From Swiss-Prot:
Covered range of the whole protein: 51 to 85 of 87
Similarity field: Belongs to the neurotoxin 10 (Hwtx-1) family. 39 (Jztx-34) subfamily.
Disulphide bridges, residue numbers: C2-C16, C9-C21, C15-C29
Tissue occurrence: Expressed by the venom gland.
Protein name: Mu-theraphotoxin-Cg1a
Transmembrane portions of the chain: none
Organism, as annotated: Chilobrachys guangxiensis
Amino acid sequence: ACREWLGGCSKDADCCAHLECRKKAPYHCVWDWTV
C-alpha cells in the first residue's frame, strides 16, 4: 500500500514515502514537510 500524496493511507510509516498518514480525518498521505 504505497499510497501517494492524498491517495489515502492506513499506516503511519508514511504510507508510500516522505509522507505521513494524516492523523486527522479524512486520513490521507500528506508530505512530512507539509500539512
